[PDB]
Design a protein around this motif. Structure first.
Motif, PDB file in Angstrom:
ATOM      1  N   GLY A 102       0.629  -1.316   0.141  1.00 40.91           N
ATOM      2  CA  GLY A 102      -0.019  -0.042   0.010  1.00 40.91           C
ATOM      3  C   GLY A 102       0.670   1.389  -0.023  1.00 40.91           C
ATOM      4  N   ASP A 103       2.238   1.025   0.144  1.00 42.21           N
ATOM      5  CA  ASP A 103       3.161   2.224   0.281  1.00 42.21           C
ATOM      6  C   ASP A 103       2.732   2.125  -1.828  1.00 42.21           C
ATOM      7  N   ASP A 104       2.882   4.422  -1.700  1.00 42.22           N
ATOM      8  CA  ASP A 104       2.458   5.061  -2.877  1.00 42.22           C
ATOM      9  C   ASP A 104       4.219   3.862  -3.772  1.00 42.22           C
ATOM     10  N   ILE A 105       5.136   3.589  -3.095  1.00 38.98           N
ATOM     11  CA  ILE A 105       5.656   2.917  -4.646  1.00 38.98           C
ATOM     12  C   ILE A 105       5.903   1.962  -5.317  1.00 38.98           C
ATOM     13  N   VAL A 106       5.152   0.669  -3.926  1.00 42.72           N
ATOM     14  CA  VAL A 106       4.090  -0.337  -3.790  1.00 42.72           C
ATOM     15  C   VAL A 106       2.895  -0.209  -5.198  1.00 42.72           C
ATOM     16  N   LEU A 107       2.066   0.930  -4.471  1.00 42.68           N
ATOM     17  CA  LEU A 107       0.694   1.243  -6.213  1.00 42.68           C
ATOM     18  C   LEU A 107       2.009   1.698  -7.146  1.00 42.68           C
ATOM     19  N   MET A 108       2.794   2.095  -7.528  1.00 41.82           N
ATOM     20  CA  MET A 108       3.055   2.475  -8.486  1.00 41.82           C
ATOM     21  C   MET A 108       4.085   1.339  -9.333  1.00 41.82           C
ATOM     22  N   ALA A 109       4.246   0.029  -8.066  1.00 43.50           N
ATOM     23  CA  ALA A 109       5.709  -1.105  -9.065  1.00 43.50           C
ATOM     24  C   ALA A 109       3.489  -1.864  -9.746  1.00 43.50           C
ATOM     25  N   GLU A 110       2.939  -2.203  -8.890  1.00 45.97           N
ATOM     26  CA  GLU A 110       1.924  -2.570  -9.102  1.00 45.97           C
ATOM     27  C   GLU A 110       1.413  -2.112 -10.509  1.00 45.97           C
ATOM     28  N   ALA A 111       0.494  -1.068 -10.228  1.00 49.05           N
ATOM     29  CA  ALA A 111       0.108  -1.008 -11.966  1.00 49.05           C
ATOM     30  C   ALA A 111       1.396  -1.294 -13.295  1.00 49.05           C
ATOM     31  N   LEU A 112       2.642  -1.090 -12.332  1.00 59.20           N
ATOM     32  CA  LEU A 112       3.645  -1.506 -13.946  1.00 59.20           C
ATOM     33  C   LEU A 112       3.144  -2.901 -14.143  1.00 59.20           C
ATOM     34  N   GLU A 113       3.297  -4.043 -13.033  1.00 58.23           N
ATOM     35  CA  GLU A 113       3.248  -4.939 -12.755  1.00 58.23           C
ATOM     36  C   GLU A 113       2.145  -5.508 -13.372  1.00 58.23           C
ATOM     37  N   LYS A 114       0.636  -4.370 -13.546  1.00 56.80           N
ATOM     38  CA  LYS A 114      -0.180  -5.398 -14.501  1.00 56.80           C
ATOM     39  C   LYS A 114      -0.543  -5.446 -15.941  1.00 56.80           C
ATOM     40  N   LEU A 115       0.365  -3.793 -16.257  1.00 53.77           N
ATOM     41  CA  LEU A 115       0.988  -3.116 -17.623  1.00 53.77           C
ATOM     42  C   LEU A 115       1.416  -4.192 -18.368  1.00 53.77           C
ATOM     43  N   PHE A 116       2.439  -4.740 -17.024  1.00 55.15           N
ATOM     44  CA  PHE A 116       4.108  -5.886 -17.730  1.00 55.15           C
ATOM     45  C   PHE A 116       3.289  -7.398 -18.013  1.00 55.15           C
ATOM     46  N   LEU A 117       2.161  -7.424 -17.226  1.00 52.90           N
ATOM     47  CA  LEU A 117       1.689  -8.695 -17.412  1.00 52.90           C
ATOM     48  C   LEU A 117       0.494  -9.367 -18.842  1.00 52.90           C
ATOM     49  N   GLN A 118       0.140  -8.231 -18.677  1.00 56.96           N
ATOM     50  CA  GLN A 118      -1.296  -7.313 -20.048  1.00 56.96           C
ATOM     51  C   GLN A 118      -0.030  -7.761 -20.741  1.00 56.96           C
ATOM     52  N   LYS A 119       1.015  -7.830 -21.613  1.00 59.46           N
ATOM     53  CA  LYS A 119       1.253  -7.230 -22.421  1.00 59.46           C
ATOM     54  C   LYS A 119       2.880  -8.076 -22.772  1.00 59.46           C
TER      55      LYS A 119
END
Ligand code: 7CQ
Length: 127
Positions: A102-119
């Motif tokens: 839930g840290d800001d940096i973790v929210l950012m990583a989670e958003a990037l990771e979601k995109l990553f997995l979509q790609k």
């Protein structure tokens, strides 16, 4: 001195290949994540000095970042797609280890990771 040498982006005696999947990882996956509003903390090795994270390299012993991955892809460092995918996963995994959910940096990583997995879900079969 608090920062380690950055991960290598070339290694002449390491074997490598160019594949359509590695091309996709650079042209699509890396490009997509690089341009994202949440990419910036991940576009270079963690600077424990600048960011006042003196414990970082006591905890994270296998650092990875997209700046490194970008250079590795540009320099044809990898033998196959899985080696590259592993670098992305190391980067995400490090973030979740060092930081609190839930840290800001973790929210950012989670958003990037979601995109990553979509790609990654559209990664072409090889050749
Ligand atoms: C208070 O500092 C921040 C708060 C929110 C964000 Br988003 C960024 C920062 S930062 O980039 O100035 N500092 C910072 C702090 C903790 C972890 C990480 N990083 C970067 C990549 C991997 C990782 O763990 C960086």
């Amino acid at each position: 001195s608090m920062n380690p040498p950055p991960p290598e982006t070339s290694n002449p005696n390491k074997p490598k290949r160019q594949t359509n999947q590695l091309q996709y990882l650079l042209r699509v996956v890396l490009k997509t994540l690089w341009k994202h509003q949440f990419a910036w903390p991940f576009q270079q090795p963690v600077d424990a000095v600048k960011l006042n994270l003196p414990d970082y390299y006591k905890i994270i012993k296998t650092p990875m970042d997209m700046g490194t991955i970008k250079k590795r892809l540009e320099n044809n460092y990898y033998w196959n797609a899985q080696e590259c995918i592993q670098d992305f996963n190391t980067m995400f995994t490090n973030c979740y280890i060092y930081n609190k959910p839930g840290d800001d940096i973790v929210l950012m990583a989670e958003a990037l990771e979601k995109l990553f997995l979509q790609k990654i879900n559209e990664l072409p079969t090889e050749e």
